[PDB]
Structure formats: structure tokens, C-alpha cells
Design a protein around this motif. Structure first.
Motif, mmCIF file in Angstrom:
data_model
loop_
_atom_site.group_PDB
_atom_site.id
_atom_site.type_symbol
_atom_site.label_atom_id
_atom_site.label_comp_id
_atom_site.label_asym_id
_atom_site.label_seq_id
_atom_site.Cartn_x
_atom_site.Cartn_y
_atom_site.Cartn_z
ATOM 1 N N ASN D 49 -5.650 -45.404 84.883
ATOM 2 C CA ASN D 49 -6.729 -46.391 84.869
ATOM 3 C C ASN D 49 -7.685 -46.021 85.998
ATOM 4 O O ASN D 49 -7.531 -46.459 87.139
ATOM 5 N N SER D 108 -15.235 -47.586 83.987
ATOM 6 C CA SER D 108 -13.810 -47.866 84.101
ATOM 7 C C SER D 108 -13.166 -47.747 82.727
ATOM 8 O O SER D 108 -13.513 -48.486 81.800
ATOM 9 N N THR D 110 -9.281 -46.333 80.652
ATOM 10 C CA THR D 110 -7.907 -45.837 80.691
ATOM 11 C C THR D 110 -7.856 -44.494 79.972
ATOM 12 O O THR D 110 -7.797 -44.437 78.742
HETATM 13 C C1 LIG Z 1 -7.369 -51.279 83.962
HETATM 14 O O1 LIG Z 1 -8.620 -51.001 83.313
HETATM 15 C C2 LIG Z 1 -9.246 -52.163 82.749
HETATM 16 C C3 LIG Z 1 -10.481 -51.683 82.022
HETATM 17 O O2 LIG Z 1 -10.983 -52.677 81.139
HETATM 18 C C4 LIG Z 1 -9.557 -53.170 83.852
HETATM 19 O O3 LIG Z 1 -10.119 -54.342 83.274
HETATM 20 C C5 LIG Z 1 -8.287 -53.522 84.616
HETATM 21 O O4 LIG Z 1 -8.603 -54.363 85.720
HETATM 22 C C6 LIG Z 1 -7.595 -52.256 85.119
HETATM 23 N N1 LIG Z 1 -6.339 -52.586 85.772
HETATM 24 C C7 LIG Z 1 -6.258 -52.972 87.049
HETATM 25 C C8 LIG Z 1 -4.880 -53.274 87.558
HETATM 26 O O5 LIG Z 1 -7.251 -53.075 87.762
#
Ligand SMILES: *[C@@H]1O[C@H](CO)[C@@H](O)[C@H](O)[C@H]1NC(C)=O
Ligand SMILES: *[C@@H]1O[C@H](CO)[C@@H](O)[C@H](O)[C@H]1NC(C)=O
Lengths: 140, 104, 104, 133
Positions: D49, D108, D110
Motif C-alpha cells: 500500500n 495512493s 495497492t
Molecule cells: C491502503 O490504501 C487505501 C487506498 O484507498 C487507503 O485508503 C488506506 O488508508 C491504506 N491503508 C492504510 C493503513 O493507510
């Protein structure tokens, strides 16, 4: 005693928000001699000027002009080092009282020659004492 | 009570600065009155040390002093004065008037 | 009495900041204790507004408040922490420790 | 939970004042586990992520893997071959700086990758980025 030109520059740039000075620092210098007006042939009246100029070397002179008070003649300005012609021009009629003359190139050489009390001569073919205006922009 | 832009008009004749400052007779410099209490708001432009100092004073007022309400941004003003006996006009005399207050 | 670099060691475990700040356990942030009285000294990096405010408070304390002893320059430090759950190392976390104090 | 790599780089640059990190901000990202390791040539997938601010510039980014082998890693978009190299050292790095540079534009997200080895210690990703603000 505040020079009228310096008072006008303060009020103009505050009232008119469309224009700003060419440089941040605008200095006014005054003449030293106050008792000379020789006359010669062909109505060629001459009189000298002297100024105590100290422009900081870490600044750049954007503009510098000489303000002279008059009442169809050829006003030519000199510099005593035997005389160095700075700028020469023409005036029209006896109605206009003041006049400006660019001496920017002269002050730029005096900045390299260092601070010194320079003397000039004007040839025309409380009082309105001529003054010198220096537009300089700081680099610090 | 709050760190705010409290007005503060100034007059140079009161402080005898009419000797060198030709014009203006005065201006609105403002001031930053109030106090800084944790938690500090982001609209007061706090610093990393100011956040820690406020927390330490909260725990022990003797351990660390309080954060202070001080100017953070200072706008310039056009003034006319004599610099070493030379009539000088500075269109941008920086550092005179306050535009933004904050804690440090 | 003077705006000086009075010592101030900090420990994040005392303020519970060990939750996100992994390392270091603490550092010497120092502090700026004292008061600013006119005339202001050049070793306190004063401002044009700070000089005027001190003169007004000297004349009339009710007209304007006094200048304050606040940090002026802040050096960075290397820290390791969690930024939104992400192990982040900042070699220069600017604004943490004080290196120069002054009046504003 | 502090990663051992992030603690080691902290002490290294604190003890030795002659060296500085290539970038101010050093972020660590973790893999999503799927308990799969087929053998034939062992392969296993990874997922991360990643959220790199667009107002930063990625100077360098490496993938830390726990182990002569021929390690070739891929990226699931089709499959995109990232890097291939040569290999008992326990850890190993593989530059994926160009991959994160495209992920910085994507926002952002994954992302998922695949590692092929021809022939706890969870693999992690290290990102060296310098702020521009
Ligand atoms: C993982 O990626 C998503 C993307 O939509 C994000 O919303 C989420 O906060 C991320 N996980 C963490 C633990 O930050
Ligand atoms: C006038 O010039 C002299 C040198 O010729 C210099 O010493 C003096 O400082 C100048 N005047 C002022 C007010 O600076």
C-alpha cells in the motif's frame, strides 16, 4: 526641511495604486554652492553645482536625475574632473519652471570611483535649490 | 485572551522619531496580544518546538515557559526619512506592519 | 532576566509521544527564557515592529504589550516515527530544537 | 513494531556524522501475506500500500528480500518484468526506483508484484524521497 519633490513621490505612490517606484530606495541630494551666477557672451550664463553622494556599493542604480529650476535655451551639463559633458538638451519657452535630466550613467561611474564630493557646471545658452535624485535597488 | 491581531495605531511624534522620520505622521502597525494554550491551532502557524513547549508547561509550568503570541509575517510600508542626513524614500520598508500573528 | 538559551531537555515518554515517535527517547530542545525591554539588543535579532512596540510599552504600558522572548532559529534533528502508520525516518525534522533566541 | 532496517539506518547516521541519507524522508512499507511458495524454482507474490506525496521527488527506492539463484521480480499490471539479477547472504536489495516513480503519479494505490527465484523476516520496501516544499 523636506524637499517638495520627495514629498510628492511619497504621496503619488500611495495614492496611485497603479504605479510603483522603479527602485525601493530613492535618495535626495542637495547642492552645496548657493552664491554663483556668472554671465558671459551670447547670453551664455553658467553656474556650478556640488553634491555629497554616498551610494552603497551593494546596490544597483536604476535611475538618477538632476532637478533644475528655471523661470528656448540649450541646457548642457558638465562634470569637473577640464570639463566632462554629461548630458545636453533643449528647453522650450519660459513657462515651465522645473526640468529633469538623466545622469544615471554618471552616478554609476562614481559608484566604482567611490564616494566623493563631485562638482558640476550648467550652461544655459528658502529658495528653489537644485537637488539630485537617485533611484537604487538593494541586493541584500 | 486569544492570540489575535489586536489593532495598534502608532504616532512617531509621541516617541520623538520625528527627528529622522519625515513622513508619515503615523500608521497602523497592529500587535499580537493574547496567549497560546495547548492545543495550538493550525491557523496560528505554530512550530514544532512551540507544540512541545506548550505540552511541557501543561505538565509542569516550572519545567518550561509558555508559548507566546508574536508576529509571524510583517508587511512593509512606504516611508520617507533621513538616512545619515540624506533624504531617503523607501517604498518598501520591510518589517513595520503586522499582517499575521502566531505562536512560537 | 535576559532573552537567552536556557536549557530544556525533553522526553517523549513523559508526554506519551512514544506512541508514534519510535526514536529518539528525547533531545535537548532548549528554551528562550527572559524578557525583552527597550532598548533591544542586537544579539536578540529584533524587528522593526519589535523596536517600536518596546518604545510604546516603555511610554505607556497600557497602550501596547511588551515584546516577547521567542525562538528565532530552529535546527533540525533526525527522528524515526510512524506517519499515519508508515515507518518514516526524517534525518532533518526541522523546527524541533532551538539554536537562536530573540525578540519579536 | 519497529523494523530492524529502519532502526539500523537511524543508528548508522547518528553514530557516523560523516554520512547522510540520500533523502530526508525514508519510508518503510510492508507486504501482504498469502502463504504460498510453489516449488519446482520457488515463486511468491507481494502486495504493498504505497502512498508517496506528489510534492516529493523519489531519489531512490529498493526492495529488501530475504534469501546461486536467479532472482527475477515482476509486477502485475499482463506481467511487467522489473529487474533480473544474480545471487549465503540473508538479505538482498533490488532497485525499483523507476517503478515507484510511476506509482507516484498513480496516487495512493495497492500495487502487487511477483518474485521468481530460479536457483519474522517479512520482506519490506524502502523509499528514499526528498521533500520539495
Ligand atoms: C491502503 O490504501 C487505501 C487506498 O484507498 C487507503 O485508503 C488506506 O488508508 C491504506 N491503508 C492504510 C493503513 O493507510
Ligand atoms: C560629505 O563628504 C565628506 C567627504 O567629502 C564626508 O566625510 C561626509 O561624511 C559627507 N557628509 C555626510 C553627511 O555624510
Amino acid at each position: 526641511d523636506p524637499p517638495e519633490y520627495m514629498l510628492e513621490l511619497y504621496n503619488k505612490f500611495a495614492t496611485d495604486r497603479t504605479s510603483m517606484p522603479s527602485a525601493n530606495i530613492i535618495r535626495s541630494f542637495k547642492n552645496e554652492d548657493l552664491f554663483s551666477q556668472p554671465v558671459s557672451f551670447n547670453g551664455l550664463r553658467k553656474y556650478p553645482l556640488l553634491f555629497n553622494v554616498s551610494i552603497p556599493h551593494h546596490e544597483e542604480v536604476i535611475m538618477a536625475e538632476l532637478r533644475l529650476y528655471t523661470l528656448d535655451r540649450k541646457i548642457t551639463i558638465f562634470e569637473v574632473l577640464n570639463m566632462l559633458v554629461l548630458v545636453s538638451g533643449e528647453i522650450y519657452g519660459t513657462n515651465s519652471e522645473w526640468e529633469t535630466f538623466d545622469v544615471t550613467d554618471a552616478i554609476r561611474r562614481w559608484q566604482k570611483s567611490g564616494s566623493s564630493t563631485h562638482q558640476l557646471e550648467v550652461h544655459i545658452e528658502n529658495k528653489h535649490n537644485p537637488l539630485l535624485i537617485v533611484f537604487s535597488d538593494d541586493q541584500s | 485572551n486569544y492570540c489575535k491581531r489586536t489593532p495598534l495605531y502608532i504616532d512617531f511624534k509621541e516617541i520623538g522619531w520625528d527627528s529622522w522620520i519625515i513622513a508619515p505622521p503615523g500608521y497602523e502597525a497592529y500587535e499580537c496580544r493574547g496567549v497560546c494554550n495547548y492545543p495550538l491551532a493550525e491557523h496560528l502557524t505554530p512550530t514544532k518546538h512551540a507544540i512541545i513547549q506548550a505540552l511541557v508547561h501543561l505538565k509542569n509550568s516550572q519545567k518550561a515557559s509558555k508559548a507566546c503570541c508574536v508576529p509571524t509575517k510583517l508587511e512593509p510600508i512606504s516611508i520617507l526619512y533621513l538616512d545619515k542626513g540624506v533624504v531617503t524614500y523607501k517604498f518598501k520598508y520591510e518589517g513595520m506592519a503586522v499582517s499575521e500573528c502566531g505562536c512560537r
